[PDB]
Design a protein around this nucleic acid. Structure first.
Lengths: 51, 115, 49
RNA sequence: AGGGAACCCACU
C-alpha cells in the first residue's frame, strides 16, 4: 500500500523546489528496484542478479 | 506590555464618580463610602478624624487591592446622628486644622527668617 | 515606620545595602496565550512554541 | 499561503 499524500506531505519550501517526506523517498527507492526487477523478468536474466 | 499608565492612579475615568454612598444593611445607621482614585493619604486622615467624633460608633477604611485605586470608608453613628453628617463634619474639621497649621507655619517661617 | 499610617513597626527590621542582580528572565518574554491559531501540517494540532 | 530535522544552552 502507498499511503496518501496527507500521510507523507510534500511542503512548498523557500527554495521553489518542493520538499518530499522521508516516506516518499523510501517509496521512490522501492519503485525503482521493483521496476528494475520487473525488467529482469520480462526478459530473462541470470538468477544471480534476480536474487 | 500590560503596564497601566501612571496617571491612572489619580485621574478619574470618563463617567467614573469620585465618591459613592451605600447603606450597610447588617446594622442600623451605617454607610459605606466608596472613593475612586484616592489612597491611604485621605483614607487614613478621614478615619482618624472620624474616630475623634464621640457620636461615631465605628470608623474604618481599607484599600481592597493595591493595584486598584479605590478606598472604602465604613461609618456607623448613633441613631441621633448620620454617617453622612459625620463624614462631612470630619472633612470640615480636617480643613480647619490644615488652615490653622498653614497660618502658623507661615508665621514661624517669617520669625525664623527675620531673627 | 509603616508608610501607610506612619506608625512605628513593633519589631525592628534588618536593613542594609546588598548587591542584587537582574536576571535575563523577564515575564514579557514568557507571557503567551492562544485562541485558534496556526497548526502543524502533518498532524493538524496547534504549533509548538 | 508557514517547512522539517539535529544538536547545544537554559528555566520550574
Amino acid at each position: 500500500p502507498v499511503p496518501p499524500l496527507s500521510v507523507r506531505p510534500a511542503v512548498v519550501m523557500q527554495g521553489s523546489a518542493r520538499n518530499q517526506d522521508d516516506l516518499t523517498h523510501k517509496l521512490a527507492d522501492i519503485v525503482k528496484i521493483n521496476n528494475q526487477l520487473r525488467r529482469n523478468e520480462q526478459n530473462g536474466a541470470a538468477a544471480h542478479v534476480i536474487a | 506590555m500590560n503596564a497601566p499608565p501612571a496617571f491612572e492612579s489619580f485621574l478619574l475615568f470618563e463617567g467614573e464618580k469620585k465618591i459613592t454612598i451605600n447603606k450597610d444593611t447588617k446594622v442600623p445607621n451605617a454607610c459605606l463610602f466608596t472613593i475612586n482614585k484616592e489612597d491611604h493619604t485621605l483614607g487614613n486622615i478621614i478615619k482618624s478624624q472620624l474616630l475623634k467624633d464621640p457620636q461615631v460608633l465605628f470608623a474604618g477604611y481599607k484599600v481592597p487591592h493595591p493595584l486598584e485605586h479605590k478606598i472604602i470608608i465604613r461609618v456607623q453613628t448613633t441613631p441621633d446622628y448620620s454617617p453622612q453628617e459625620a463624614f462631612t463634619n470630619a472633612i470640615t474639621d480636617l480643613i480647619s486644622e490644615l488652615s490653622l497649621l498653614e497660618e502658623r507655619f507661615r508665621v514661624a517661617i517669617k520669625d525664623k527668617q527675620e531673627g | 515606620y509603616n508608610g501607610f499610617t506612619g506608625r512605628k513597626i513593633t519589631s525592628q527590621i534588618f536593613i542594609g545595602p546588598t548587591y542584587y542582580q537582574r536576571l535575563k528572565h523577564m515575564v514579557d518574554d514568557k507571557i503567551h496565550s492562544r485562541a485558534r491559531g496556526p497548526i502543524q501540517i502533518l498532524n493538524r494540532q496547534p504549533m509548538e512554541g
